[PDB]
Assembly symmetry: D2
Homo-oligomer: 539 residues x 4
């Protein structure tokens, strides 16, 4: 509710009497179901791999490298030019594209077979003998959707015609085998660089520096413990009339150096790929000041004149590759690659900070009036101690319901002795630590008072739910009062909980978390012989 | 050359005599070959598509969307669950992966055929009958490179063994056909979203907002005038217990709204994909205040409960897709998609600003001393006018060469009348406009003096090369003087150019640009009867 | 040098004989002065504070906050409205702007004083009695530069007039005191937020979320050990008809949570600023998993209705501030703030990786021919061992100099016994570790062979310079040969070094690093009794 | 400098500590409210001393 200017402003000017210290209201806490930790924040969360890409992509740009986009699909021949007599071995790890072919059932072999199948279906076929209408096959194939044959302005027909030409027919169509092609995916911007280079050297002026961080597919065939089938390669190439492996080392440094890496070094690669001038293919191991043993993040080399020759390139080229997902794991400290590339496909651990915001309140008054009464009734209960009952706390509010219904006397006390006016606690914060749910009053004992570093604010780990016992307890009470004014009840005082958990004192829990609490042997120590039946009549 | 502090500082303090106005030197112009436009700047250039991705990726994050990475390769069955009886039509545009299979030549059919091929080669085979050694095939296939069999510490062998098992053998290996699989690529994060969703709804707490801008492959089979085979889809999904098409419209707005788009609107899609609840698939046409007719940038819908059911999802999902390359063209105003995705694969037009930096100087003194003499000799020539010759400008410098060689008298004048002391110009800037090369003195004529808006600084388009006639001309002269002190020449005065172009006055041109100038009917109007033989002896 | 296509391509096709393995050349290592570590990479380096700003600025945007720019300079009165009776204490830390005032020397007091100073100078004053010309003072003050009075088309005058009206005059002008004003800088976007709010609440529709990370000036008067005079405040404000301190806690979380912070918590601020509703000003301490004890990164509160009233704001406001430089230090692990805000103003430590690239080669052949000879001559020296001399390695190359000058017999050997043909090393890499310069051959000894983890590639820390002894040594020799063909020398064999450092074997060092090596007690252990006088005649 | 702002802060009006030789027995309490405790002149000498 918005407040008035002068209404409050007057408390100032010249008539300033406890103005500031007052007016604290005008801004009430929006219920308890939205008071945080129950109230969480929202913000776009960038994926670790994609972010790492947007960082490298930026890493190069700051080195002056020109961003490119190499062809993703290359022809089997293009790899022969680069690798050569070796390609016949590398292709072992390359996927080949394929599509809807031709089973060669006719149009050539159809000389002694065609008078067999003349309608292998059992439904309706409007119109008559109008053989063929959509000759849109190999003549400008204009298709891709359904709604093949229909109807418009007429009657008794509807939008439907020929939506059944399979199932109980076409035996050799479900097992149809799309014939392969000479078009294959790739691996490393290299198989693309040449192409992107061949027809670029004579169009631009050297020296030339280029980079392209895109996808690639390294055929591994099912690998849940050794990368996947498609990774991101942060490659680049340096076209220079005078370049060597050194131009590669420097790049690898200037690149890693932008992530806080100071220790890496290089070591000759045994693979000695034949598309690389001999003795240049050097691996680039990296070890960032933290976990992740010296792991290979990159690998670069020089394009052998022979290979560059086949592409009509009259100048040496240096190429450095860097596995994005590789460096990715090092950055965010990830072990299982899969668990990173696809964050949500397994884990989902809920941190203590989350649990707190998942320990909601069971029942509460659904009437702003009563709700307010609760809070008010709660601050009241904060009084006295033991006395084996009774007291003098009965006379209470008398607000209306639907018509004159009021006079709701609520008496509060603790009949059972040694439990104060309400108990030796009723002020337990109910914190959350190491996945466990505790909650203890700011007092002291001696036995389990070792959980100091645990829970409790100040300099003691653990997140609070900002909910004391009495809170849920009273809300439970006031809730009932409400549930009664509609059920026609005159008296109260109830009981139901028994040694179990934090039930009672209200506070329920979302499925998740509760699925973890028990799924990981977490304890929920609260303990509360509340009861506080406390007689409350409505007359 | 670095200067001295006090040396210059003294000219101040209390003895301040034209100090500032002087000391202009100490900072000489680094030659003429590096004086700009010849001196161009370098900076990383981000690709239009990738940048657009880094913008959208950021567009979502600012809307609170969570970044993900959906599986790129899905099984043929996963599409059946989403599409269903329709998938048998959409698969028409989906590539299937494949690799090194088994021709079924033996290990099953090998019962009456094996005593035929026992060595189809004609070279060397070290050692003896040691049939098989690397049984690393179907038993933990540890391969991928060459260097198969080698040698280490010994003599007479070298690193080479068995690098020939084809060519003149294996007839059915080059035509080998990698058998297909049940693994196919995809199209739209959708075919991935379900998967990424199915096993995520019960791990997280709703509502749920996710996005992933990654690659996809829409089988089109050779399309140079209709997208390619792999595009980028900026998709997203909103998991909410209460969502509808509206949640899609809003996204499309909040998304496009971050690019300056205010006009878009939506229209129902006729395709009515069956993996979308009926009457939800609405296209999202966009028209940014500029070129590019109202073009479809997005398209969203709602996942039909049936489809979501097959994936064990108990809640509606809204999915909005946006073609990155699509919006890409609208942003950078591109027509041909290909010409954008792969910038350098055709065009490379050189803007006037480039030409200027490509109009270099033909010949120049290779001796700092002479070079300096040129510049000095150039400012000198700036004198007098006509006189049908002669004058009194002979006595000149006398610097050393390799030993006492000096006394180089250089006389300057214009023998032919009506050509001033050098000419009615010799101060032509040589500008570049509309791809043409002009250059005219700051004087006036009357005929072609219409090219005012063209060339010339101030408020008249066109880029200058900052090179006057005399410049190249004198450099040409001084150059010769130099070329002579080594050739043993005593006199000079030469001639060679004739009505052609800007030859003479030096200034040559790089292959490119010159390939355009003529390749696009550009004119090179300079015209210069220089000659200035000007006698110059060295004794 | 560019190579030919077919020239190399022919080695393939069908005539493939050691093609790949060959052609290794065509790409020579560009000298040794540019072979890395001597060859370092370059890339724009973002300042830690500014980057942190570009991260927070992005942190908010991802939370939906609207970016603003609050006024930097506010009037003394604006702070009174916010703070009130307290402002009279806070202003103690606020700078006040000031400019060229009026000493009140006349125009009011000029009644009995004006006939005193009528020209307190001793130079020239062109023209005559033309009292005043530029009445551009308080009447549209159009000034700001010099070139006050000048001259154009004429003779005997030059661009200069009245450039002297001080020094030997105006006694009370150098000590001139610019009078203060009611305009002061600020501290925290707060003093700006109100203003930015007051005239914004009725223009926009609530709720309202805003943020602005800009500068602020907290008067501390010289603080080299307690922040400076101007810091960056990453503040924000949430205008909501229903907001409380909680809306602040959540922000602080959603903000820090985007830096990897999971531990922070809040604690009530004792300061209890009166411009904040009582009991809301809560500090926000943060402890990132690393160094930097629990340090206060933020602090937020609620604007007291009274203060908001004075600005005509009819609704509570939540404000959270965050010291950028504060979080900055935590991120990049900085102790001294100054050492961060102004990176280069003290330190500049050169990491080992740098030293390597600063250990250049003393002297080298300045003739491509000789240079090449060196490298060739170097691989040659790699032969034999001890023999107390001599051998059979004299006959050598015979290339031309300036004319027939050739036949340069270079004999190589080690006269002194127990030093092999050259020495028991001459292959020392010369590494760099812990700021020290070592370098040892890949052999072994037993005494100091404890520096294994030190230097040496593989899995042993330390950066190499990729320079062996012989390298510098031979370059030194070949260098001489060259220096001789011009000095007219016939024989050689020299000596000059003695127990000192790595001198000899060439290799010098840049001033810096060498300033550190000794400035921090670093050792340079090489030790080399080279000598290798090796007789070399030129006839 | 004609276009440059100069910083400034709480100065000293030079009312005493130097000119206080014939003026100090004038203002000994220019207020009309409460002042707890008694004659305990000064307690927070936190001015020019840290």
């Amino acid at each position: 509710m918005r407040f008035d200017i002068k209404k409050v402003l007057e408390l100032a000017e010249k008539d300033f009497e406890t103005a500031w210290r007052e007016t604290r209201a005008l801004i009430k806490d929006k219920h308890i179901d939205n008071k945080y930790p129950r109230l969480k924040p929202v913000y776009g969360k960038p994926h670790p791999v994609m972010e790492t890409i947007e960082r490298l992509r930026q890493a190069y740009l700051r080195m002056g490298f020109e961003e490119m986009i190499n062809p993703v699909i290359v022809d089997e021949m293009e790899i022969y030019k680069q690798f050569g007599p070796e390609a016949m071995a590398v292709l072992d790890r390359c996927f080949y594209l394929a599509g809807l072919p031709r089973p060669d059932v006719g149009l050539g072999n159809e000389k002694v077979e065609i008078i067999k199948n003349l309608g292998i279906d059992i439904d309706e076929e409007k119109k008559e003998r109008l053989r063929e209408v959509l000759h849109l096959y190999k003549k400008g194939a204009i298709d891709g959707d359904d709604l093949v044959f229909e109807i418009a302005k007429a009657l008794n027909v509807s939008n439907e015609m020929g939506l059944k030409v399979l199932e109980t027919a076409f035996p050799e169509f479900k097992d149809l085998k799309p014939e392969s092609t000479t078009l294959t995916l790739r691996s490393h911007m290299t198989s693309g660089w040449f192409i992107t280079l061949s027809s670029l050297i004579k169009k631009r002026k050297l020296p030339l520096k280029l980079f392209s961080i895109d996808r690639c597919f390294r055929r591994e065939q099912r690998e849940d413990r050794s990368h996947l089938m498609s990774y991101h390669s942060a490659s680049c190439v340096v076209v220079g009339e005078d370049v060597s492996v050194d131009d590669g080392k420097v790049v690898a440094e200037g690149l890693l150096a932008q992530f806080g890496f100071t220790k890496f070094k290089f070591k000759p690669d045994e693979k000695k790929s034949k598309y690389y001038t001999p003795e240049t293919q050097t691996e680039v191991y990296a070890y960032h000041p933290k976990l992740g043993e010296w792991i290979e993040v990159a690998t670069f080399g020089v394009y052998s004149p022979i290979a560059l020759a086949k592409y009509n390139i009259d100048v040496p080229v240096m190429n450095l590759g860097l596995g994005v997902e590789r460096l990715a794991m090092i950055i965010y400290g990830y072990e299982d690659v899969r668990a990173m590339v696809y964050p949500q496909f397994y884990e989902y651990r809920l941190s203590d900070r989350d649990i707190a915001g998942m320990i909601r309140v069971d029942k509460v008054p659904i009437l702003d009036e009563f709700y307010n009464f609760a809070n008010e009734l709660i601050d009241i209960c904060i009084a006295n101690k033991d006395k084996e009952s009774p007291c003098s706390v009965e006379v209470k509010r008398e607000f209306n319901f639907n018509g004159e219904r009021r006079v709701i006397k609520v008496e509060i006390f603790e009949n059972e002795p040694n439990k104060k006016l309400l108990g030796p606690s009723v002020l337990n914060e109910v914190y959350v630590y190491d996945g466990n749910i505790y909650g203890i009053p700011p007092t002291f004992e001696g036995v389990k008072e070792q959980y100091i570093p645990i829970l409790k604010k100040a300099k003691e780990e653990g997140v609070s739910t900002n909910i004391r016992y009495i809170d849920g307890i009273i809300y439970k009470l006031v809730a009932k009062i409400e549930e009664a004014l509609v059920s026609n009840v005159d008296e109260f005082k109830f009981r139901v909980p028994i040694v179990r958990s934090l039930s009672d004192i209200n506070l329920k829990i979302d499925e998740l978390a509760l699925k973890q609490i028990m799924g990981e042997n977490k304890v929920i120590d609260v303990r509360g012989p509340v009861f506080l039946n406390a007689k409350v009549e409505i007359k």
